[PDB]
Amino acid sequence: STTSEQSARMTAMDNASKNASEMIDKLTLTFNRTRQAVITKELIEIISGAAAL
Amino acid sequence: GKREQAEEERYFRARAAEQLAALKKHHE
Amino acid sequence: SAGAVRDAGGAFGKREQAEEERYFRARAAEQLAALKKHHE
Amino acid sequence: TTGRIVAVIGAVVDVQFDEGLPPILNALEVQGRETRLVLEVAQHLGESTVRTIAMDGTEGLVRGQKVLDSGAPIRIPVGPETLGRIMNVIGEPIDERGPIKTKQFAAIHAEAPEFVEMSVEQEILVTGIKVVDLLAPYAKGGKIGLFGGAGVGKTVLIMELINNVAKAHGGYSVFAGVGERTREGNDLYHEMIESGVINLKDATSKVALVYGQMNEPPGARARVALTGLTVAEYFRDQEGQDVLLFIDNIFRFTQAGSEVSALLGRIPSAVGYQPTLATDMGTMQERITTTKKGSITSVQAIYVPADDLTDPAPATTFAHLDATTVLSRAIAELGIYPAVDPLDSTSRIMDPNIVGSEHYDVARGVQKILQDYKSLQDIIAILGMDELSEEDKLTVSRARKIQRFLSQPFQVAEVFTGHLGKLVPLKETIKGFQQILAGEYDHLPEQAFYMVGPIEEAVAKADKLAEEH
Amino acid sequence: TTGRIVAVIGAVVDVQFDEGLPPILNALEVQGRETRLVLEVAQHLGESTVRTIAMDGTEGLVRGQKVLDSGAPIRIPVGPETLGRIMNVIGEPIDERGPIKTKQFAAIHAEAPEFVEMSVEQEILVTGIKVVDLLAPYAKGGKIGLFGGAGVGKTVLIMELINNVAKAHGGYSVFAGVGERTREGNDLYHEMIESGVINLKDATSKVALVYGQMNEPPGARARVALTGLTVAEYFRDQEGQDVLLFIDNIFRFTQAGSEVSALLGRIPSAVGYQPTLATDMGTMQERITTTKKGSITSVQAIYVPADDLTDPAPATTFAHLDATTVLSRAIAELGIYPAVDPLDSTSRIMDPNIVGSEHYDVARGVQKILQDYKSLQDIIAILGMDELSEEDKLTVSRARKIQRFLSQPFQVAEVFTGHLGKLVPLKETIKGFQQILAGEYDHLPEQAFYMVGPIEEAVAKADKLAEEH
Amino acid sequence: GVGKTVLIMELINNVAKAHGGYSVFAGVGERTREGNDLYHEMIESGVINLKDATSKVALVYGQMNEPPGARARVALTGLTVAEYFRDQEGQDVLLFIDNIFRFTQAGSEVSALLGRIPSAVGYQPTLATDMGTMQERITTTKKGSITSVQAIYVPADDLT
Amino acid sequence: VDLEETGRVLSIGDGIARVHGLRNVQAEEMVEFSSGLKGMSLNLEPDNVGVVVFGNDKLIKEGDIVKRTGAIVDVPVGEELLGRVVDALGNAIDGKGPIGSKARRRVGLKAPGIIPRISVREPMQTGIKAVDSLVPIGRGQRELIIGDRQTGKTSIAIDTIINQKRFNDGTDEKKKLYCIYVAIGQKRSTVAQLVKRLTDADAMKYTIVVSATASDAAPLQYLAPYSGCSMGEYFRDNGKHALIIYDDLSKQAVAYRQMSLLLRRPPGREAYPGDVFYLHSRLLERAAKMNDAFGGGSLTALPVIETQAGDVSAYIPTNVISITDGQIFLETELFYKGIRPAINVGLSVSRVGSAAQTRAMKQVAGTMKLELAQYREVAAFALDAATQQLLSRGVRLTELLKQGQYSPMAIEEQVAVIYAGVRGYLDKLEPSKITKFENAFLSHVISQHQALLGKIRTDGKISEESDAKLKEIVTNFLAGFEA
Amino acid sequence: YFRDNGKHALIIYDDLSKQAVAYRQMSLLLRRPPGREAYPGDVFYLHSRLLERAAKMNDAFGGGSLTALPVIETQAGDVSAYIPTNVISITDGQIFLETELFYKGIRPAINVGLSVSRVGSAAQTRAM
Amino acid sequence: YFRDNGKHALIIYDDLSKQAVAYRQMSLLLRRPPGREAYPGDVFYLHSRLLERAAKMNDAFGGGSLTALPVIETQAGDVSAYIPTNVISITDGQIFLETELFYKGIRPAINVGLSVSRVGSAAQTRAM
Ligand SMILES: Nc1ncnc2c1ncn2[C@@H]1O[C@H](COP(=O)(O)OP(=O)(O)OP(=O)(O)O)[C@@H](O)[C@H]1O
Ligand SMILES: Nc1ncnc2c1ncn2[C@@H]1O[C@H](COP(=O)(O)OP(=O)(O)O)[C@@H](O)[C@H]1O
Ligand SMILES: Nc1ncnc2c1ncn2[C@@H]1O[C@H](COP(=O)(O)OP(=O)(O)O)[C@@H](O)[C@H]1O
Ligand SMILES: [Mg+2]
Ligand SMILES: [Mg+2]
Ligand SMILES: [Mg+2]
């Protein structure tokens, strides 16, 4: 039973790290999409402001 | 996460097979 | 960064806060019993 | 009085007059053109000059070209003769069947019904769709809104509702093709001639078609929504009929407005939209409503830019709707059709007083277990199902069966899906989901619930799957 | 000299002078008004015309209305007559207690003290609060900052310091209601009469009052901090004595500027703020400091929009402060009051040479265990408390007890909590947390340390909790 | 710390030794220090020779210290030198641009100063055309070719 | 002929008239066009006057004559508006003739200063169990109702208005509260249902309705909350008390943005003007509690904000939260579950929980606040047998916080229903049966045990005798309920 | 020319992404309100009027047809971006292509789940 | 001055973050075109030309030197922000400081993993 749980916990935590790695990859893409959108939106406000002067 | 859906769908596919086994043996 | 899980405020953060609260509730009961023993 | 064109930049055109300057909203006939071009006055720039918006392409226009004033807005034909005929933004027939002969006309612009003219009677409308009737049921003489991203299933859903509701309903109907596929206009036109709701030889048509599709310029697409709206007003007011308005897609009205607001010389608002986004929609949407005399049940398809509901265009429409139907892509990509989000779609008639205490209690029960199932996704992702509690496994199991039971085969989807379409009654829907929540089908598999009508056919489908040995 | 108004748009007003043109930062008296309306010059547009900002509502103003140049900036009453009296941004009284007959006046705009006038005499100031005096103790004759989001306890924190420090302080004090609730201004004025810091029948008033709440326009709120600190300059310069300068809220100075930045003709900066942020803050901030002649000990409440410390307004203010007290919402939602972040609030005087080695070593020891406690929380989220080692379980136990011992009930906030207020001495705080880190309160529960004064009351509360259980 | 300059000099050396074509290095918007390091490393290696006329490299520099307009068109200056060896002498030329991102932001800086409404992520409206008119010149003609090794600095590790 | 008191339209587009002339016109002055439409002079420029149009601007052509009213924008006020439904300007729109107002208050008056005000003392009873207990609203206070679309925001305001029938029908003069519902943006059909609802509940006779719907122009939607505030200040100053509901300030800001942008004023954050904080701050500040010297009356405000996807950190939401005295965070998560009203207890606060609560309510509410607070810490689970029953209490109490629409309870009745849960008569009972339990329990107590409810109202607390009576009623009822 | 004269033609726009960037340049240089990703308001109209010209004419109008195969470039598989969703809302279905399947060796790398053809099911040989 | 007379110098800019804010304010009030985060177009060039002047001269040009230690204030440890990335890309290495390491006890709180010195590794005593 001791050797069974250590082999299972090894693979269980291995899956947890690999499942976490996939969520980080997809969130990193969503992060970079939202990163660019904020940079573009904030800049359009400044251009909108300058034109109205 | 895609592997969240992978693990969940795997679990419930196995349990779906168990439920179909009990369902067929009860049907007989 | 350190303590980034609870800063997010999700499933793991709230379940971690609840875990600590439970553990230290039990230990608070045991310690109050220790105060009963020392007083008596 | 004659007017001279002084500036032309895209859809916007500036016309100057010597005497008799036309007011705002009035249509202007541009002379010296092969096809009938129409300019609607928008602003008064000053110095006897007015800014206008063209209802067709502005190519070929020269500065100094004469422009006559009609003395009124865009007036169109309205009556029983508009049924079974295809109209454009400026009233003309675009089906090659001669002119639309009517004894009265009506302008596309008009004030919304006054406060005293509003109605109070809120009656339920049974669709047949399980996810709809249980969670966010529609109402008769209300305002239904079908939100959805690019290709989630709005044009299929609207056609299902037309196939079910508009067929079995003793009253007239209106379809407004606003800025969508012209191919879909051709498909709808022939499909309705085939069924019988439209008739070429006889005068027994139920539907009135109005089209200003995505091949049209922004001036047409911005005003064609009002053209089809005005047809429904006639049947409501002067006849007192129960009308069914079908606008696909209403977003294009606002999108077209954004394209012209730039050229009208306005300062842009958030996300590049027009500053008059709420008011232009307000004056339009308020006309689509049930008055004391007549009644209109509007089903409006709403596009969602980049799957973002926080976008100004869809965000503003929510207030103008009684019942909402939020179609999600994540739900559609899983195979669950129709992809109606059960924790996003809402309705105002969803109340124990109206739908009943048993309906409301079962409605919240579905949403409760779906919310609990969604709350444990982070835990299942990293740790797994084995790390969850024994009682939590039961809540996750039923939610997935509830998710799959919310799906339903469609009548119009038969052509490509293959499976026969289902039409589930109200009482059978509430009974079906209530048994799953109570735990009367926990022994059965999930795939038995996927794509079935009532709960009875789900149990029979499980026995079919039981015969893989 | 005469000057007629040529344009009025919102708070901004343009005045055209015929010959005598006024300098920038000059008070202009608008004639033909029921209430007084001061206009301050900001820019020179050219063609003998200037742009101004209104200190009150601009409704009623007409083009061609006469405006006279005072020949100087906004000058206000200064002296002992201002003590126990409320006044406007312009200088007039608004407590219905007649005119403030001062023998000498002072302009709200003035050049800040030079580099040569700066002092470097660092000395600790004991307030009474444990989390403050331990981790980020204030400097006697220094600049104190109280950062916090919406409803995290900024007003309760600053009002406690007025109640605690001003009584022990043998001198004068000043309070500035800059763009905050007038309800709070009502609550403060009455309770200071009850405590006796502002006497009515005789002239023995300690505290002075200036107000310009969020009911006022931007131009008013943008100049209240300047009006407030100008009073403190008189009590610093003329009278060779110490002085306290409480401000709430100083964020509204920078906010009010951005409300008129667009109308003044400026291209907007990042996050909607004006480009003149650091300079407009700089000319104001460095005036509030200790010269070699006097000594201002300011306490500035700083609003943090959406709990965003990276926001331009609060972020720029950090450079102007010696001691800071950063308030966190996450700490407030637990019940820890005052919700002071121990791993963020710091001070320049926190040094073993300045406040002794015993004070420094204990304070750092508290911040060490609390920082390591954050790292263990990430491990506990996956494993749990039970799977941890014997060493790590004790670290968490000591950390949770220290967190709760940092909390404290205030005398000003009795109705909120229910318990009576406390005031812990200096050496009690250093020795109190030292005993916890040493491991001399492992047997006691963490609940006994929540909301108490010194370490003695934590032991005394443990006796009550034992007998009740 | 990866033998970047060593790789560059070898490609310069081998293409000259095998295919018989000279090389061009275009320093665009990087450090002048690095230009000094590369210049002397090339002399110690042999690709540049001060004593005799057997040098295989033609250097063109316009670094951080120079203004946006100068940095914007350095790659064009170096490219034109490579165009000579291709068009006139009919060689297989080897061009180097370091860094190509500096050419981009220089173009973004020039467009901003001229008074143009910035595109997505603050870049210039003419991002594609400015890159297009430069890159399309680097090709294989019927007379010869120019193969370009361009150093790319991806900002914020974001390929999108 | 005349250009002093008269003007001509240079340009007109998007409801913004640029008028040549009008030299003697004041800032924020109302002006009449030749067609009959009115307008407001906001932008005074050297060569023109920027005038916003109140209503459709199709009739306003170029070169139209623009007269002067010679007075700042104002609206009719008094007690005659109680019962009638009006627009932003204060005209009748319910087809019941023209109402006769005595006075006319200004729309943009300054809020009362520091001296006239006094701390809040008397309570503002909403009649909602969750509100009056945990988030107690006092008279003169400003309490924010924030949340997403379709999360029971307007429903809270309606139940508050219907609850005042208990006080207004009685003889006690000070306890009366006149209501004022301001509608900004929302469509007419929705507003027509609200009036129909208030009419059926006999609520309209002491309520005023200011309707500025989507069909109306932006200036009317912009002005409507200020017009309603002035109508409420009539009561505030003259001894009486009033209640106002801005539903909603988010749709007001959108109109103000449109109005501002078309006047060529430069944009700010999310295209909004620079002074959008000033817009809502000066409006809300006017709601206050006047002292005995100036009158003793008050004005209670209830602003509404629509958050997008639960983003309270957005621009306009963060502004209003800092203004108001407290806020009530409504959430979709709780709303979908079944918890209606979906008031988040942990996040929502009143900041005046003492005088705003009655002494009777303070006993049961204070203990309920503690138990729910301890429960939410140890919530994410469903073991220790001691804290096993603690998790039950929280679920039992949370089911009592549920409340059906259009049924506001009295202060004495709310104490009775909490008494069962707080003392532990629902611990053994199943969570699903509590709605059925409270339904029968409340109807039973009101029917027969009237004197017990009366004694709590008389004494103003839970006396030892009254405590003993409830102890025997709930036990006998519980035994009858189960068996 | 083929469509109207009773003949059939195929057209391939490779790609409309690069066209939109070129039109964005024209719009930003003209100084007009930029929306999502700095694109103008009529960037949808740009592609919509182009694609609808591809059609199937009846026997009355010659019986010819024009078939369109437009191309779009996504960034890191962002299917729900601004310009891609516009062309998805115009066209009669789409063919998604995965970077994973392509790198793994599966070519053509067609995403079976997301790729759909609406009107193509009708115009297909019964043998298939 | 020291560099060009055979002497060594050390300059410390504390800090270049606030310099950009002042430069931004100055340009915007002159009505020069704005750019990303409201900074002017040449905000990179601001620090680049400043830092480039810091150098090490050979024997032929005096043999002096000017060492530059610029300072940047990050927001929440974000090294990938606009202004920081510009200055990071100019310098010959950086010394990153974390708030986490400071409170844990590590003072000076120098992140050894991220902090690097490319050029200075050679310029060091052999004893070290
Ligand atoms: N306590 C409740 N019990 C039953 N139903 C409720 C309750 N509260 C709200 N509802 C239902 O929720 C619906 C929406 O509530 P409400 O009218 O407050 O919307 P809102 O949040 O104000 O937003 P909007 O007015 O934009 O829809 C109502 O139609 C009502 O039937
Ligand atoms: N009820 C449904 N069942 C199965 N598939 C559906 C259903 N509704 C829509 N779809 C799928 O979605 C696709 C697009 O539908 P459509 O209504 O054209 O979306 P949209 O109108 O949002 O562009 C169809 O090709 C169809 O395969
Ligand atoms: N010392 C404290 N003890 C208990 N509660 C507090 C304390 N300080 C603030 N609060 C809570 O916060 C609210 C007051 O916060 P306030 O000082 O107004 O913050 P802000 O000034 O940032 O708006 C009260 O409702 C109270 O419950
Ligand atoms: Mg569609
Ligand atoms: Mg405060
Ligand atoms: Mg509402």
Side-chain angles (χ1 to χ4, degrees), chain G residues 153-154 186 247-248:
Chain G
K153 298 205 298 297
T154 309
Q186 62 189 307
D247 190 23
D248 52 74

Side-chain angles (χ1 to χ4, degrees), chain H residues 21 33 36 38 40 45 70 93 95 97 100 104 113 122:
Chain H
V21 171
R36 290 179 167 282
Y45 179 55
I95 302 165
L97 295 161
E100 285 79 357
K104 194 169 185 176

Side-chain angles (χ1 to χ4, degrees), chain G residues 20-21 32 72 121 174 279 383 394 464:
Chain G
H20 171 69
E32 297 183 332
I72 301 305
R121 306 188 194 283
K174 281 81 170 187
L279 186 78
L383 305 175
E464 294 171 36

Side-chain angles (χ1 to χ4, degrees), chain D residues 143 278-279 281-283 285-286 316-321 348, chain G residues 88 154 181-191 210-225 245-256 258 304 306:
Chain D
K143 298 184 73 173
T279 51
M281 189 189 295
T283 50
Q285 286 291 324
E286 286 274 40
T316 310
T317 51
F318 283 109
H320 298 261
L321 300 162
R348 294 182 175 181
Chain G
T154 309
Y181 183 79
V182 191
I184 310 93
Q186 62 189 307
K187 60 180 167 65
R188 286 171 172 171
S189 59
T190 311
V191 176
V210 184
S211 185
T213 62
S215 52
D216 301 320
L220 296 166
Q221 295 181 35
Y222 159 81
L223 196 71
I245 307 93
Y246 313 113
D247 190 23
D248 52 74
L249 298 181
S250 293
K251 289 170 178 65
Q252 192 211 358
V254 171
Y256 181 53
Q258 178 183 328
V304 178
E306 185 186 47

Side-chain angles (χ1 to χ4, degrees), chain G residues 87-163:
Chain G
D87 71 341
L89 299 171
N91 300 31
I93 56 171
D94 55 2
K96 302 183 176 184
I99 197 69
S101 57
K102 301 296 98 179
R104 294 182 67 78
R105 196 181 185 79
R106 229 181 213 181
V107 302
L109 297 176
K110 294 169 69 64
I114 298 162
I115 303 302
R117 294 166 188 259
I118 190 65
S119 183
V120 177
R121 306 188 194 283
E122 65 267 38
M124 201 284 289
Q125 300 296 341
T126 56
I128 304 170
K129 289 167 283 190
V131 177
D132 295 330
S133 63
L134 297 160
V135 193
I137 307 172
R139 300 206 168 185
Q141 191 186 354
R142 306 157 292 176
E143 192 65 26
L144 179 58
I145 302 166
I146 194 166
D148 296 353
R149 64 188 156 280
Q150 305 267 39
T151 63
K153 298 205 298 297
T154 309
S155 302
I156 297 290
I158 295 289
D159 292 23
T160 304
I161 294 160
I162 298 159
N163 190 53

Side-chain angles (χ1 to χ4, degrees), chain B residues 3-5 7-9 11-12 16 19-20 23-24 27-28, chain D residues 373 380-381 385 393 397 400 404 442-446 462 469:
Chain B
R3 300 199 187 190
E4 182 275 319
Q5 294 181 352
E7 286 192 336
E8 187 170 298
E9 292 288 331
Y11 183 87
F12 284 110
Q19 282 176 346
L20 287 164
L23 182 59
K24 72 180 185 180
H27 196 98
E28 290 169 23
Chain D
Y373 166 56
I380 297 159
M385 292 289 294
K393 289 180 179 182
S397 302
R400 291 159 54 79
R404 286 160 176 76
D442 292 325
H443 69 268
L444 296 177
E446 298 173 8
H469 299 228

Side-chain angles (χ1 to χ4, degrees), chain A residues 13-30:
Chain A
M13 295 293 94
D14 184 38
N15 294 358
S17 58
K18 287 189 178 186
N19 286 26
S21 297
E22 294 278 18
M23 292 181 73
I24 292 158
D25 290 3
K26 293 199 293 182
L27 285 167
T28 302
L29 294 172
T30 311

